[PDB]
Amino acid sequence: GDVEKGKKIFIMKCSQCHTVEKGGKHKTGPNLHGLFGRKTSQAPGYSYTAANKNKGIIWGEDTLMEYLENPKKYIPGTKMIFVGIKKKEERADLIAYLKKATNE
Ligand code: HEC
């Protein structure tokens, strides 16, 4: 739940493909601002896969905990090529950071 540690994980693991700031660029992956409490596939201006659109979950602490352990198990056919993060506490820290930064 540690936002300082989660920021560092974001930078190392995610930041090459994602921005989190309001109005931030889409890059390889979508800008993530506003995601908490949204369905998948909601960022206008981004080309998602049908797999992502068809997942039909709401993004939130628990769903992101599962997704980020193993993205392709959670959303088969996703084009996010990221193997996932093993440690539950590392995912928890990252998600706390995302919950701060994507709501800012
Ligand atoms: C490129 C190598 C990426 C890295 C590293 C990470 N992500 Fe990603 N993400 C990427 C793409 C190309 C996509 C679109 C996938 C699709 O099938 O359309 C995504 C998607 C996400 C999502 C879902 C976004 C939404 O539904 O609106 C999330 C929540 C997400 N990515 C988060 C995320 C995090 C936290 C990362 C670090 C652990 C991370 N991704 C790495 C590309 C890439």
UniProtKB/Swiss-Prot annotation:
Binding site for heme c: 14, 17-18, 80
N6-succinyllysine sites (modified residues): 55, 72
Recorded superkingdom: Eukaryota
GO cellular component terms attached to this protein's record: apoptosome; cytosol; mitochondrial inner membrane; mitochondrial intermembrane space; mitochondrion; nucleus
ATP-binding as UniProt keyword: no
Keyword terms: Acetylation, Apoptosis, Disease variant, Electron transport, Heme, Iron, Metal-binding, Mitochondrion, Phosphoprotein, Respiratory chain, Transport
Coiled coil regions, renumbered to chain: none
Gene Ontology terms, MF aspect: electron transfer activity; heme binding; metal ion binding
Post-translational modification, as annotated: Binds 1 heme c group covalently per subunit. Phosphorylation at Tyr-48 and Tyr-97 both reduce by half the turnover in the reaction with cytochrome c oxidase, down-regulating mitochondrial respiration.
Phosphotyrosine modification, residue list: 48, 97
Pfam families linked to this entry: Cytochrom_C
Keyword Acetylation found: yes
Regions that span the bilayer: none
Family to which the UniProt record says this protein belongs: Belongs to the cytochrome c family.
Illness the protein is tied to: Thrombocytopenia 4: A form of thrombocytopenia, a hematologic disorder defined by a decrease in the number of platelets in circulating blood, resulting in the potential for increased bleeding and decreased ability for clotting.
Protein name: Cytochrome c
Native species: Homo sapiens
